[PDB]
Amino acid sequence: ARGVKKNSDVGGWHYSPAGEERAVIARASIQPLYPEDTPDEEAMVKGRLNKVSVGTSGQMIIDDALTCCTQDNYLHFQHVPSLMNAISRFFVQLARQMKHSPDGITAAGLTKGMTKLLDRFVASGALVAPRDPDADGTEPYVLKVTQAEFDKWEVVWACCPTGVARRIQGVPLLIK
Amino acid sequence: SQYSIQQSLGNASGVAVSPINADATLSTGVALNSSLWAGIGVFARGKPFTVLAVTESNYEDVLGEPLKPSSGSQFEPIRHVYEAIQQTSGYVVRAVPDDAKFPIIMFDESGEPAYSALPYGSEIELDSGEAFAIYVDDGDPCISPTRELTIETATADSAGNERFLLKLTQTTSLGVVTTLETHTVSLAEEAKDDMGRLCYLPTALEARSKYLRAVVNEELISTAKVTNKKSLAFTGGTNGDQSKISTAAYLRAVKVLNNAPYMYTAVLGLGCYDNAAITALGKICADRLIDGFFDVKPTLTYAEALPAVEDTGLLGTDYVSCSVYHYPFSCKDKWTQSRVVFGLSGVAYAAKARGVKKNSDVGGWHYSPAGEERAVIARASIQPLYPEDTPDEEAMVKGRLNKVSVGTSGQMIIDDALTCCTQDNYLHFQHVPSLMNAISRFFVQLARQMKHSPDGITAAGLTKGMTKLLDRFVASGALVAPRDPDADGTEPYVLKVTQAEFDKWEVVWACCPTGVARRIQGVPLLIK
Amino acid sequence: ARGVKKNSDVGGWHYSPAGEERAVIARASIQPLYPEDTPDEEAMVKGRLNKVSVGTSGQMIIDDALTCCTQDNYLHFQHVPSLMNAISRFFVQLARQMKHSPDGITAAGLTKGMTKLLDRFVASGALVAPRDPDADGTEPYVLKVTQAEFDKWEVVWACCPTGVARRIQGVPLLIK
Description:
The structure is cut from a larger assembly and holds 3 copies of chain A. Chain A is an alpha+beta fold.
């Protein structure tokens, strides 16, 4: 909730619930239950289980953004499904606005509304240019609206999410 | 604990530091891409007989660690590359002896590894058994450091195809283990990763990986299986002896360099001293309208240096854009802190690249690679080889051989701009052929832009484009008014475009170059 | 197809499929197969085999417009047979429009239609005045329509194509 309030137009859904800034436990005098036992990071991550760590001020934080997806594609992070669901919900609202209308104005209105919404999301930093330029082009979003029969309008849109910068690996070395 | 800091990153979200290393150095830089150099050479690592790309950041990785002066005389090209890498990118091509071999690991149907090695060039074939084999292609012998292969099973796909994660790790001599990169591969013909990318072993390795390649038999792959293996290390990789290389290898490397489809406006000797290789390079630079910066063996004394240039075969009226340098001095190496001797192509190209970056529209090609401002040697504690011997300025100039001198700050410089033209006209200087070649290249670009067009617009377009290009060059100071006013008029450039037949448009242009102010003669006198 | 879409009335058939403007290969990271081997331009053109070259932006192009005619007349270029075939196809359409009709209106209709089509083509720049004035006159097209019998109308037309400006020869020289 603290992350979603940074933006005002559509809300900062692309933020992850982690880090010093937002997720702070800060209850009181935290003490572990079983000191002898030790965790296992790799096996725990294999089981899709988020862990807690310690921040700068001594107040523990929530240092993970793992969802419950077993597949190892992009939507196994936390913010990507949230972004996709936010876009889907806004599209559902817009479609509900344009229901039960006579033919002639549905196609153009649907196209312009979808384009406006995708542009609004792009301006918020949620969507970035594709990391693979030659195959995916250089368009953050792609839109296509088609009609099937007397009814059954079909709308398909594609987009690219943003990175998280989860893991960082330093390496000091003496210059002597 | 939540306060602990691991050593090597796995898959969990965390920040880790590595153990404090001592025997490693780093360098940073941003490429400029104003004029790209190229040239053959001999190094460790790198794919042989294929043009690479070298910048100021990855030159320590793609081109391998520096060689050793003790191990023969194969340490020249890396020093030359480092000298000229601090100005722009590069397109070096590596050549290896015939006895150089690369490691290969081959697997049976049951999954039993079988170490082996093979020489370069020859393709890899599989016998009746031994379903698939995986081999390195970077060319590193994997002896220092060592690279190990680790295979672990993973989850199957929707179609039921088996998939196993493949991990390549590098082990240092001390004992520290570093993971290079891992990917999920499968032996099935049509296995697809969950994100849509392919997972067939040859395609997967040849698509995203950068270190290994694999070949798969097309008859045993259907029933082939794998197992779990730990620390499969390559053995038998060895590049042979780099000191002795046949001229045929150099010729093949030069021929490969000639066909590389990239812009490069200068070819460097890069320590190549064979006469045939230098002649082939000279043929190269006179075909693409560029300028070479070759040299001769620094160990030669002043007496026999002059016949060497004629022995090269560069001298004449055809290889007009090249240049030859000599440097019989011993410096202190930057890496091993030893007394080593190497050539002078790198500094000459560095001076040329620094000169060409002054202007921005068309580049300052009309600057000569000399003087305090641009060409500075500045390696370390320069000391001559043979103090007793003395040069001869006039005879050496007669042989078209550039010399070095001392500067104001005690750092030696390159005090010449002599090309390899025997005729005594204006184009025997260095900057005049460079200017002419730059104008010719720009005209070639403009003409290629105006090809295969219907009649009516060719003449006017050609005339206006040529005129605007010549005007742009005049505004840069490259061209000046003629020194002979009554005979040549007072127009820095003259242009004429004509049509011959259905085809064969002909364009002729004339121009006047600028002076250099090479020689200066002072004369004091007492007024008493 | 890029060339034929410039003009709109009859289409720019007189453009050659070459040059920086239209023909750009531009796939990805092009690398040669056999670096050691080198081509032979003269033998290759003798064999009627178009070649590829490199453009200004680093993207290779199609730098040839050679057809498969062994004879060394004008029909061994690419755009001339295309122009002639376009004119022939349009004439075929015109003739099919003027079929199975009673006498008295065939000759005038055929003549006026053929002349209008040739005028439309010369106005597009496809046809130019003859390069040799004294022998060929100064008419870009010549037309003659004749009747043979109860049937078998015969129509003959002549025209002159345009140049391509394929080869260009520069020659710098120092004015000292």
